[PDB]
Amino acid sequence: MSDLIEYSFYLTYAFLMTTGTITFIEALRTKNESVRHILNLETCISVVAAFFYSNFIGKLEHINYEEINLNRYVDWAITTPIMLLVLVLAFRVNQTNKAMVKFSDFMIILGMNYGMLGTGYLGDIGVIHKTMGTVLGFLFFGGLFYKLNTLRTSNASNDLLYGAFFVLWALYGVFYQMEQLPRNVGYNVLDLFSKCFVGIYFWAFYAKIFTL
Amino acid sequence: SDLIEYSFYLTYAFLMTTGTITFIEALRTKNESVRHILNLETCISVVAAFFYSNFIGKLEHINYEEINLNRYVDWAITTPIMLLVLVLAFRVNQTNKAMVKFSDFMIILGMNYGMLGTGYLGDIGVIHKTMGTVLGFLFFGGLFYKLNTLRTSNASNDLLYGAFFVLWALYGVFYQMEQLPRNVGYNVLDLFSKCFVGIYFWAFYAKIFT
Amino acid sequence: DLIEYSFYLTYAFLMTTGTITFIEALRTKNESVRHILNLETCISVVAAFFYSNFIGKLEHINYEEINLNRYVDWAITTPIMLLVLVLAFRVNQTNKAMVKFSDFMIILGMNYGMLGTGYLGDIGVIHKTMGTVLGFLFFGGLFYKLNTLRTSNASNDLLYGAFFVLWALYGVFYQMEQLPRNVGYNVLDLFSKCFVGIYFWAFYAKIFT
Amino acid sequence: SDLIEYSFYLTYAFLMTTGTITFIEALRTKNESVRHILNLETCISVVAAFFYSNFIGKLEHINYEEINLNRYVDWAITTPIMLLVLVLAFRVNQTNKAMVKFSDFMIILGMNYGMLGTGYLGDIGVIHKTMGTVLGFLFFGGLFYKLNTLRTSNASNDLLYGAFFVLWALYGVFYQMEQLPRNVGYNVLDLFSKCFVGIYFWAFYAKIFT
Amino acid sequence: SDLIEYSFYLTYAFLMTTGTITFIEALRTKNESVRHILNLETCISVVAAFFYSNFIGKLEHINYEEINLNRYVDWAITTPIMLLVLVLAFRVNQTNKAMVKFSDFMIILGMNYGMLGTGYLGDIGVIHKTMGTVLGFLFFGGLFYKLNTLRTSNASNDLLYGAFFVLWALYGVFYQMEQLPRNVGYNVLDLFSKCFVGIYFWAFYAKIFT
Ligand SMILES: *C/C=C(C)/C=C/C=C(C)/C=C/C1=C(C)CCCC1(C)C
Ligand SMILES: *C/C=C(C)/C=C/C=C(C)/C=C/C1=C(C)CCCC1(C)C
Ligand SMILES: *C/C=C(C)/C=C/C=C(C)/C=C/C1=C(C)CCCC1(C)C
Ligand SMILES: *C/C=C(C)/C=C/C=C(C)/C=C/C1=C(C)CCCC1(C)C
Ligand SMILES: *C/C=C(C)/C=C/C=C(C)/C=C/C1=C(C)CCCC1(C)C
């Protein structure tokens, strides 16, 4: 419907407020400093993404779908590095109970990440063909997730986390190719999973809320 | 009419109250299990408060029907958190540990979203309103049957179960009514189901009442 | 003029009171004091919200409408204020913030009887004189019940007395025309919410000799 | 006009700074007396920042005389808090306990409000400005006489007492000026009397300066 | 065209990020010297975010020269905090105590305000643009000479000193450029000088990198 399109913006916006609140409160109370650092970063992701969604929502009346998708890049440029830092710190917490990563390794991750995003952007503004942007983008994505895989030690949380990021982030590249309207809706739903459900997972995991 | 406006403000203002009370106690309780429950409760008030502020802001720009359709977005976010709180509280009251089996929680959510989804489909004409009611209440039955299996008897658990049972059933009753009185009813139900329940959790864990 | 200033004075004092109780609620090592200051913070939060609304409207709305709107604020703040009062009595008498729920429900019943009958009088469903008479009957029940929970001591007596007088004065100002009644209620809120809030903070913080 | 615009924004932004720094430290200091002082200082910034945001929002329909009259509502709230901070600071500097006699503080407030009240009556013409100045300054003297009696000799106490005496006296001096320079002067005095004093307390108790 | 507007949003949103991260760690670190640094860092993000929200508000009908003039108010508040952080950071890295001589800090501020003030006179045409450039950079030299004397050698201090040196000098470079490129340059420099520096402090004290 016209309804469900607008609803997708609100759903993600409100779930970002939920995720931001839950990680904020636990970041302020966890006794584990490494968990605090992860939950602190996670709060920042929700804060930033919520800001951009509030902008999008403020423009719904005369919505320009293409404009919105281009604006998302500003959000992505800020949140993707934070999300990736969280991922690699979490790998290490799961292995050694300390949040640490080599800065050099992290800069290589970011290089691949920004190659991926920058290529996507060049395609959207027509500096390169969209088709080329897609393939070159996915190549950088491959470099990103290969490098990520080298920092991962095998265990249930690390495998789920890696697998979730792999699939969710790949789907951005899939939705990239769609028309502006369905692309927006897909991205809204992907953000709900990649930011909010991931954040809620981190909280629930460290809080030991669930028995498997 | 005027009823609509006052009832919106009442619930909105009480959500601020509930959110503040649970936030402060989440940050200061020495019991981590209570923190998790009160943290979740704070999320509920934050999300609902956002929706109420939006409804109030748009009151002269949207109709009663649209507001009721929009509530589903709020419900889609708040109902799962509320149910998580419920089942976590069940265990906290028994063992002082906030845990539930993820599989049990996913079954709870399945029933919850069948309830909400079939209600929504009836509301938008995809199925007959009356089927919305029947299927909704059938899923409601599944939901509370499953909740009951995780309820262990004690005073608090029984009160909580009963309160949820009655309040949540009443949403299905007000679903029957015309758009205006339905809005007012939902406003008041939210006051009870989110705000007064949230204050109960606070007061219960704070040992405010004998 | 000073009718608009009175709105700002109370609004700004609510911000002060809310800030002061918030920070101390978050730092006190006494859990009972935390519960009381937590509730006090809520009172300031809610009343501040309604005052920001009244202020946003001073051009667009008549003074009767503002007074009727206050009942929504009152319906929320009064039960929290009463809960604080009985918990404070209890803290003085037992070092613990507790009350019997049944006792609190009786208190709330009297309170809403009082507010409800007052409201009915304000909107003309019953006469103003009947609103006052029934209102004060419920007021009497309320303050009678409150007194049965009160043990004698400096703080409990000061508190009980403060509430008794300040709350009776709402019923006094109820008799006035709409404009002075607004100024009156603004000043009473400053006392009943803000100065009481500040009292609790100062008392538990042992700021004064 | 520009001068007064820029000076509004300067003080407003510095109030945000001061409120943030005292807020965070009030929440973490292990000294309860310092907490009370920093809590109070936070309130001062919150209130004054509210009023400055108001002045700023009024700029496009600005009435300089109106701004100066509105300041009295701010002063009526912030001055008692500032004075309470001052006398508690005196005591902390000697016994490390934030306490004062209620009766002493009520006398302080009596003088403070005589001062503000008579100044106000002069501004709105109930009495002549000159009579406002004379009464105002007499109340100022009573206030600072009483303040001085609660003051123990001490490096911090002396700097504080002197800073307050001078800065507060200057409000009475700018009261005499035409509305424009009066506003700019008040904006800068507020910067010193609220913000710089607030940052002093933080820095002093945090021991960041040798 | 897009990139210019985007540069405001990037820095604004990164300020929100930096403010959040230092706020949470300020409230939880067990080292109070680190708290004081992170407290100050939070203030910087709060103040700059306020001004960036203002600029973003003005993008439709944007006057590039006005914005750059407006920035001086931001600068007048944030630069002294940033310099305080820098010198406390020097000491914390060497002694693990956040302390500086007040006299040293006032000399630093003298130079800092000489730099900003002369730069401002150049912009508003009271002195020629190349003059402001030359004199401003003289004060900058004084500032960074003095800072260097407070610096003791080590990895973090050398990095911090070099980053501040280069970034702050670059404000002087972009000062020569036309209003539009100058805005974009300042937006990016603020990202580095406030946000990336603040994130560095957080990461450094949290020891998340090796
Ligand atoms: C919260 C926002 C997130 C996690 C955004 C992630 C964005 C991507 C993973 C984009 C990926 C792309 C490709 C893999 C191909 C090229 C086009 C892109 C940039 C959409
Ligand atoms: C805070 C909001 C809450 C707790 C909403 C709960 C909503 C329901 C329990 C809705 C129930 C319904 C039925 C039981 C029948 C079908 C129609 C519904 C969805 C209104
Ligand atoms: C913060 C607001 C407060 C404490 C409001 C209290 C309001 C009352 C005590 C009203 C009392 C009334 C009567 C005692 C008689 C009838 C009229 C009323 C409702 C104003
Ligand atoms: C934050 C605001 C402050 C500290 C305001 C203080 C105001 C005064 C000290 C005003 C003093 C006056 C006199 C001493 C003479 C009469 C006129 C007054 C009210 C301006
Ligand atoms: C967050 C904002 C910051 C760190 C601003 C710093 C501003 C400067 C370092 C300005 C320097 C200038 C000169 C060195 C000479 C030319 C004029 C100035 C003021 C732009």
PDB file of N, CA and C in Angstrom, chain E residues 131-204:
ATOM      1  N   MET E 131      46.594  40.291   6.327  1.00  0.00           N
ATOM      2  CA  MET E 131      47.061  40.684   7.646  1.00  0.00           C
ATOM      3  C   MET E 131      46.565  39.680   8.666  1.00  0.00           C
ATOM      4  N   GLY E 132      45.243  39.523   8.719  1.00  0.00           N
ATOM      5  CA  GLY E 132      44.619  38.558   9.610  1.00  0.00           C
ATOM      6  C   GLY E 132      45.338  37.234   9.494  1.00  0.00           C
ATOM      7  N   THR E 133      45.671  36.863   8.262  1.00  0.00           N
ATOM      8  CA  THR E 133      46.371  35.612   8.013  1.00  0.00           C
ATOM      9  C   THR E 133      47.718  35.600   8.730  1.00  0.00           C
ATOM     10  N   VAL E 134      48.475  36.683   8.575  1.00  0.00           N
ATOM     11  CA  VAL E 134      49.828  36.772   9.120  1.00  0.00           C
ATOM     12  C   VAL E 134      49.854  36.875  10.646  1.00  0.00           C
ATOM     13  N   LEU E 135      49.159  37.867  11.198  1.00  0.00           N
ATOM     14  CA  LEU E 135      49.072  38.059  12.648  1.00  0.00           C
ATOM     15  C   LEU E 135      48.425  36.868  13.349  1.00  0.00           C
ATOM     16  N   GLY E 136      47.364  36.342  12.745  1.00  0.00           N
ATOM     17  CA  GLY E 136      46.650  35.205  13.311  1.00  0.00           C
ATOM     18  C   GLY E 136      47.614  34.058  13.468  1.00  0.00           C
ATOM     19  N   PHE E 137      48.400  33.816  12.425  1.00  0.00           N
ATOM     20  CA  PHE E 137      49.378  32.741  12.457  1.00  0.00           C
ATOM     21  C   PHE E 137      50.532  33.028  13.415  1.00  0.00           C
ATOM     22  N   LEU E 138      50.816  34.300  13.684  1.00  0.00           N
ATOM     23  CA  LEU E 138      51.812  34.649  14.702  1.00  0.00           C
ATOM     24  C   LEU E 138      51.346  34.144  16.060  1.00  0.00           C
ATOM     25  N   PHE E 139      50.110  34.484  16.413  1.00  0.00           N
ATOM     26  CA  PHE E 139      49.502  34.013  17.661  1.00  0.00           C
ATOM     27  C   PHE E 139      49.439  32.494  17.706  1.00  0.00           C
ATOM     28  N   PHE E 140      49.142  31.894  16.561  1.00  0.00           N
ATOM     29  CA  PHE E 140      49.173  30.444  16.413  1.00  0.00           C
ATOM     30  C   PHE E 140      50.555  29.903  16.753  1.00  0.00           C
ATOM     31  N   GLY E 141      51.593  30.570  16.250  1.00  0.00           N
ATOM     32  CA  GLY E 141      52.961  30.172  16.566  1.00  0.00           C
ATOM     33  C   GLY E 141      53.214  30.260  18.052  1.00  0.00           C
ATOM     34  N   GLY E 142      52.816  31.375  18.651  1.00  0.00           N
ATOM     35  CA  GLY E 142      52.917  31.526  20.093  1.00  0.00           C
ATOM     36  C   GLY E 142      52.199  30.397  20.810  1.00  0.00           C
ATOM     37  N   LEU E 143      50.956  30.150  20.401  1.00  0.00           N
ATOM     38  CA  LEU E 143      50.133  29.095  20.991  1.00  0.00           C
ATOM     39  C   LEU E 143      50.850  27.751  20.936  1.00  0.00           C
ATOM     40  N   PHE E 144      51.296  27.367  19.745  1.00  0.00           N
ATOM     41  CA  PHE E 144      51.883  26.049  19.581  1.00  0.00           C
ATOM     42  C   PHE E 144      53.305  25.943  20.095  1.00  0.00           C
ATOM     43  N   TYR E 145      53.989  27.074  20.215  1.00  0.00           N
ATOM     44  CA  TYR E 145      55.258  27.080  20.922  1.00  0.00           C
ATOM     45  C   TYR E 145      55.008  26.742  22.382  1.00  0.00           C
ATOM     46  N   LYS E 146      54.086  27.480  22.997  1.00  0.00           N
ATOM     47  CA  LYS E 146      53.737  27.276  24.404  1.00  0.00           C
ATOM     48  C   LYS E 146      53.242  25.853  24.685  1.00  0.00           C
ATOM     49  N   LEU E 147      52.407  25.325  23.796  1.00  0.00           N
ATOM     50  CA  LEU E 147      51.908  23.961  23.948  1.00  0.00           C
ATOM     51  C   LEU E 147      53.052  22.966  23.906  1.00  0.00           C
ATOM     52  N   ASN E 148      53.995  23.210  23.008  1.00  0.00           N
ATOM     53  CA  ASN E 148      55.146  22.337  22.883  1.00  0.00           C
ATOM     54  C   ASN E 148      55.956  22.264  24.179  1.00  0.00           C
ATOM     55  N   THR E 149      56.047  23.376  24.905  1.00  0.00           N
ATOM     56  CA  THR E 149      56.800  23.405  26.164  1.00  0.00           C
ATOM     57  C   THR E 149      56.140  22.564  27.250  1.00  0.00           C
ATOM     58  N   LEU E 150      54.831  22.362  27.134  1.00  0.00           N
ATOM     59  CA  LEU E 150      54.079  21.572  28.107  1.00  0.00           C
ATOM     60  C   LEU E 150      54.098  20.097  27.746  1.00  0.00           C
ATOM     61  N   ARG E 151      54.475  19.815  26.512  1.00  0.00           N
ATOM     62  CA  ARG E 151      54.453  18.460  26.010  1.00  0.00           C
ATOM     63  C   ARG E 151      55.701  17.708  26.438  1.00  0.00           C
ATOM     64  N   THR E 152      55.516  16.512  26.979  1.00  0.00           N
ATOM     65  CA  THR E 152      56.627  15.605  27.204  1.00  0.00           C
ATOM     66  C   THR E 152      56.558  14.522  26.132  1.00  0.00           C
ATOM     67  N   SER E 153      57.712  14.009  25.726  1.00  0.00           N
ATOM     68  CA  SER E 153      57.761  13.116  24.577  1.00  0.00           C
ATOM     69  C   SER E 153      57.171  11.735  24.863  1.00  0.00           C
ATOM     70  N   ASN E 154      56.269  11.310  23.986  1.00  0.00           N
ATOM     71  CA  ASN E 154      55.809   9.932  23.925  1.00  0.00           C
ATOM     72  C   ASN E 154      54.854   9.779  22.748  1.00  0.00           C
ATOM     73  N   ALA E 155      54.493   8.541  22.440  1.00  0.00           N
ATOM     74  CA  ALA E 155      53.730   8.241  21.232  1.00  0.00           C
ATOM     75  C   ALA E 155      52.418   9.045  21.147  1.00  0.00           C
ATOM     76  N   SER E 156      51.609   8.975  22.198  1.00  0.00           N
ATOM     77  CA  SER E 156      50.316   9.660  22.214  1.00  0.00           C
ATOM     78  C   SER E 156      50.475  11.187  22.145  1.00  0.00           C
ATOM     79  N   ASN E 157      51.383  11.733  22.952  1.00  0.00           N
ATOM     80  CA  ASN E 157      51.619  13.179  22.972  1.00  0.00           C
ATOM     81  C   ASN E 157      52.121  13.727  21.649  1.00  0.00           C
ATOM     82  N   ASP E 158      53.000  12.982  20.988  1.00  0.00           N
ATOM     83  CA  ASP E 158      53.534  13.445  19.719  1.00  0.00           C
ATOM     84  C   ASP E 158      52.437  13.419  18.663  1.00  0.00           C
ATOM     85  N   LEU E 159      51.634  12.358  18.668  1.00  0.00           N
ATOM     86  CA  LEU E 159      50.520  12.253  17.733  1.00  0.00           C
ATOM     87  C   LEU E 159      49.550  13.413  17.948  1.00  0.00           C
ATOM     88  N   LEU E 160      49.118  13.580  19.196  1.00  0.00           N
ATOM     89  CA  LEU E 160      48.183  14.645  19.555  1.00  0.00           C
ATOM     90  C   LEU E 160      48.700  16.018  19.162  1.00  0.00           C
ATOM     91  N   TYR E 161      49.955  16.305  19.505  1.00  0.00           N
ATOM     92  CA  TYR E 161      50.531  17.602  19.196  1.00  0.00           C
ATOM     93  C   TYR E 161      50.583  17.825  17.685  1.00  0.00           C
ATOM     94  N   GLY E 162      51.039  16.818  16.946  1.00  0.00           N
ATOM     95  CA  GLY E 162      51.135  16.931  15.493  1.00  0.00           C
ATOM     96  C   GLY E 162      49.782  17.097  14.820  1.00  0.00           C
ATOM     97  N   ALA E 163      48.804  16.291  15.235  1.00  0.00           N
ATOM     98  CA  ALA E 163      47.450  16.414  14.695  1.00  0.00           C
ATOM     99  C   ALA E 163      46.852  17.794  14.959  1.00  0.00           C
ATOM    100  N   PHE E 164      46.963  18.283  16.190  1.00  0.00           N
ATOM    101  CA  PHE E 164      46.457  19.621  16.497  1.00  0.00           C
ATOM    102  C   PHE E 164      47.206  20.666  15.669  1.00  0.00           C
ATOM    103  N   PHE E 165      48.534  20.570  15.644  1.00  0.00           N
ATOM    104  CA  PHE E 165      49.324  21.512  14.848  1.00  0.00           C
ATOM    105  C   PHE E 165      48.828  21.587  13.405  1.00  0.00           C
ATOM    106  N   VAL E 166      48.777  20.447  12.722  1.00  0.00           N
ATOM    107  CA  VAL E 166      48.391  20.427  11.310  1.00  0.00           C
ATOM    108  C   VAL E 166      46.941  20.861  11.104  1.00  0.00           C
ATOM    109  N   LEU E 167      46.028  20.275  11.864  1.00  0.00           N
ATOM    110  CA  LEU E 167      44.615  20.595  11.695  1.00  0.00           C
ATOM    111  C   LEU E 167      44.330  22.058  11.960  1.00  0.00           C
ATOM    112  N   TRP E 168      44.861  22.600  13.049  1.00  0.00           N
ATOM    113  CA  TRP E 168      44.569  23.987  13.393  1.00  0.00           C
ATOM    114  C   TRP E 168      45.206  24.960  12.400  1.00  0.00           C
ATOM    115  N   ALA E 169      46.374  24.602  11.874  1.00  0.00           N
ATOM    116  CA  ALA E 169      47.003  25.428  10.853  1.00  0.00           C
ATOM    117  C   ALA E 169      46.113  25.434   9.619  1.00  0.00           C
ATOM    118  N   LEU E 170      45.535  24.283   9.295  1.00  0.00           N
ATOM    119  CA  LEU E 170      44.666  24.187   8.124  1.00  0.00           C
ATOM    120  C   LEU E 170      43.439  25.105   8.205  1.00  0.00           C
ATOM    121  N   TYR E 171      42.972  25.444   9.407  1.00  0.00           N
ATOM    122  CA  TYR E 171      41.935  26.467   9.521  1.00  0.00           C
ATOM    123  C   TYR E 171      42.446  27.788   8.927  1.00  0.00           C
ATOM    124  N   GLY E 172      43.724  28.089   9.154  1.00  0.00           N
ATOM    125  CA  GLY E 172      44.348  29.297   8.612  1.00  0.00           C
ATOM    126  C   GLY E 172      44.502  29.258   7.099  1.00  0.00           C
ATOM    127  N   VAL E 173      44.727  28.071   6.556  1.00  0.00           N
ATOM    128  CA  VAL E 173      44.810  27.912   5.111  1.00  0.00           C
ATOM    129  C   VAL E 173      43.447  28.150   4.454  1.00  0.00           C
ATOM    130  N   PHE E 174      42.412  27.481   4.953  1.00  0.00           N
ATOM    131  CA  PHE E 174      41.088  27.587   4.327  1.00  0.00           C
ATOM    132  C   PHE E 174      40.471  28.966   4.512  1.00  0.00           C
ATOM    133  N   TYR E 175      40.967  29.691   5.507  1.00  0.00           N
ATOM    134  CA  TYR E 175      40.609  31.085   5.736  1.00  0.00           C
ATOM    135  C   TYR E 175      40.847  31.991   4.511  1.00  0.00           C
ATOM    136  N   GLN E 176      41.800  31.628   3.647  1.00  0.00           N
ATOM    137  CA  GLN E 176      42.122  32.447   2.467  1.00  0.00           C
ATOM    138  C   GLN E 176      41.099  32.239   1.365  1.00  0.00           C
ATOM    139  N   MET E 177      40.454  31.082   1.383  1.00  0.00           N
ATOM    140  CA  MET E 177      39.655  30.644   0.257  1.00  0.00           C
ATOM    141  C   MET E 177      38.309  31.351   0.236  1.00  0.00           C
ATOM    142  N   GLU E 178      37.604  31.236  -0.885  1.00  0.00           N
ATOM    143  CA  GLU E 178      36.303  31.870  -1.046  1.00  0.00           C
ATOM    144  C   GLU E 178      35.329  31.250  -0.044  1.00  0.00           C
ATOM    145  N   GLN E 179      34.191  31.902   0.184  1.00  0.00           N
ATOM    146  CA  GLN E 179      33.285  31.514   1.272  1.00  0.00           C
ATOM    147  C   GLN E 179      32.797  30.067   1.172  1.00  0.00           C
ATOM    148  N   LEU E 180      32.472  29.635  -0.039  1.00  0.00           N
ATOM    149  CA  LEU E 180      31.867  28.329  -0.225  1.00  0.00           C
ATOM    150  C   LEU E 180      32.874  27.206   0.032  1.00  0.00           C
ATOM    151  N   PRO E 181      34.009  27.204  -0.689  1.00  0.00           N
ATOM    152  CA  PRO E 181      35.019  26.181  -0.405  1.00  0.00           C
ATOM    153  C   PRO E 181      35.485  26.231   1.049  1.00  0.00           C
ATOM    154  N   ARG E 182      35.425  27.415   1.640  1.00  0.00           N
ATOM    155  CA  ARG E 182      35.901  27.604   2.987  1.00  0.00           C
ATOM    156  C   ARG E 182      34.968  26.877   3.971  1.00  0.00           C
ATOM    157  N   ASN E 183      33.668  27.025   3.765  1.00  0.00           N
ATOM    158  CA  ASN E 183      32.691  26.289   4.550  1.00  0.00           C
ATOM    159  C   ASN E 183      32.934  24.791   4.474  1.00  0.00           C
ATOM    160  N   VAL E 184      33.135  24.275   3.266  1.00  0.00           N
ATOM    161  CA  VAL E 184      33.296  22.841   3.120  1.00  0.00           C
ATOM    162  C   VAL E 184      34.574  22.406   3.848  1.00  0.00           C
ATOM    163  N   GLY E 185      35.627  23.212   3.734  1.00  0.00           N
ATOM    164  CA  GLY E 185      36.899  22.911   4.394  1.00  0.00           C
ATOM    165  C   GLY E 185      36.801  22.896   5.913  1.00  0.00           C
ATOM    166  N   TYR E 186      36.094  23.872   6.463  1.00  0.00           N
ATOM    167  CA  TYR E 186      35.883  23.951   7.898  1.00  0.00           C
ATOM    168  C   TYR E 186      35.022  22.795   8.408  1.00  0.00           C
ATOM    169  N   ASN E 187      34.011  22.414   7.624  1.00  0.00           N
ATOM    170  CA  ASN E 187      33.164  21.271   7.961  1.00  0.00           C
ATOM    171  C   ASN E 187      34.010  20.007   8.084  1.00  0.00           C
ATOM    172  N   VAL E 188      34.919  19.796   7.135  1.00  0.00           N
ATOM    173  CA  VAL E 188      35.772  18.613   7.176  1.00  0.00           C
ATOM    174  C   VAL E 188      36.809  18.710   8.291  1.00  0.00           C
ATOM    175  N   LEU E 189      37.394  19.886   8.469  1.00  0.00           N
ATOM    176  CA  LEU E 189      38.369  20.083   9.543  1.00  0.00           C
ATOM    177  C   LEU E 189      37.739  19.838  10.925  1.00  0.00           C
ATOM    178  N   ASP E 190      36.514  20.323  11.124  1.00  0.00           N
ATOM    179  CA  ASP E 190      35.782  20.083  12.385  1.00  0.00           C
ATOM    180  C   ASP E 190      35.568  18.584  12.618  1.00  0.00           C
ATOM    181  N   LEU E 191      35.276  17.862  11.546  1.00  0.00           N
ATOM    182  CA  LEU E 191      35.159  16.419  11.614  1.00  0.00           C
ATOM    183  C   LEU E 191      36.441  15.786  12.162  1.00  0.00           C
ATOM    184  N   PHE E 192      37.587  16.234  11.659  1.00  0.00           N
ATOM    185  CA  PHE E 192      38.869  15.705  12.103  1.00  0.00           C
ATOM    186  C   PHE E 192      39.233  16.244  13.486  1.00  0.00           C
ATOM    187  N   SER E 193      39.125  17.555  13.647  1.00  0.00           N
ATOM    188  CA  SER E 193      39.661  18.223  14.831  1.00  0.00           C
ATOM    189  C   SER E 193      38.819  17.997  16.081  1.00  0.00           C
ATOM    190  N   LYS E 194      37.518  17.787  15.913  1.00  0.00           N
ATOM    191  CA  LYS E 194      36.641  17.570  17.068  1.00  0.00           C
ATOM    192  C   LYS E 194      36.270  16.091  17.157  1.00  0.00           C
ATOM    193  N   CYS E 195      35.696  15.548  16.086  1.00  0.00           N
ATOM    194  CA  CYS E 195      35.159  14.195  16.115  1.00  0.00           C
ATOM    195  C   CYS E 195      36.237  13.115  16.138  1.00  0.00           C
ATOM    196  N   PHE E 196      37.145  13.128  15.166  1.00  0.00           N
ATOM    197  CA  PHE E 196      38.157  12.083  15.123  1.00  0.00           C
ATOM    198  C   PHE E 196      39.078  12.180  16.345  1.00  0.00           C
ATOM    199  N   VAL E 197      39.426  13.393  16.758  1.00  0.00           N
ATOM    200  CA  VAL E 197      40.201  13.554  17.995  1.00  0.00           C
ATOM    201  C   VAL E 197      39.449  12.993  19.213  1.00  0.00           C
ATOM    202  N   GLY E 198      38.156  13.285  19.322  1.00  0.00           N
ATOM    203  CA  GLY E 198      37.374  12.780  20.449  1.00  0.00           C
ATOM    204  C   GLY E 198      37.269  11.262  20.436  1.00  0.00           C
ATOM    205  N   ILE E 199      37.028  10.702  19.261  1.00  0.00           N
ATOM    206  CA  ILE E 199      37.024   9.254  19.106  1.00  0.00           C
ATOM    207  C   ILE E 199      38.400   8.654  19.434  1.00  0.00           C
ATOM    208  N   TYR E 200      39.479   9.337  19.056  1.00  0.00           N
ATOM    209  CA  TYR E 200      40.820   8.882  19.439  1.00  0.00           C
ATOM    210  C   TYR E 200      40.939   8.773  20.964  1.00  0.00           C
ATOM    211  N   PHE E 201      40.505   9.805  21.685  1.00  0.00           N
ATOM    212  CA  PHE E 201      40.634   9.780  23.135  1.00  0.00           C
ATOM    213  C   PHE E 201      39.871   8.619  23.735  1.00  0.00           C
ATOM    214  N   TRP E 202      38.644   8.428  23.273  1.00  0.00           N
ATOM    215  CA  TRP E 202      37.846   7.303  23.716  1.00  0.00           C
ATOM    216  C   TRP E 202      38.570   5.984  23.444  1.00  0.00           C
ATOM    217  N   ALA E 203      38.961   5.770  22.195  1.00  0.00           N
ATOM    218  CA  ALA E 203      39.623   4.524  21.813  1.00  0.00           C
ATOM    219  C   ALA E 203      40.932   4.335  22.581  1.00  0.00           C
ATOM    220  N   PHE E 204      41.706   5.407  22.690  1.00  0.00           N
ATOM    221  CA  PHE E 204      42.983   5.350  23.391  1.00  0.00           C
ATOM    222  C   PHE E 204      42.800   4.914  24.844  1.00  0.00           C
TER     223      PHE E 204
END
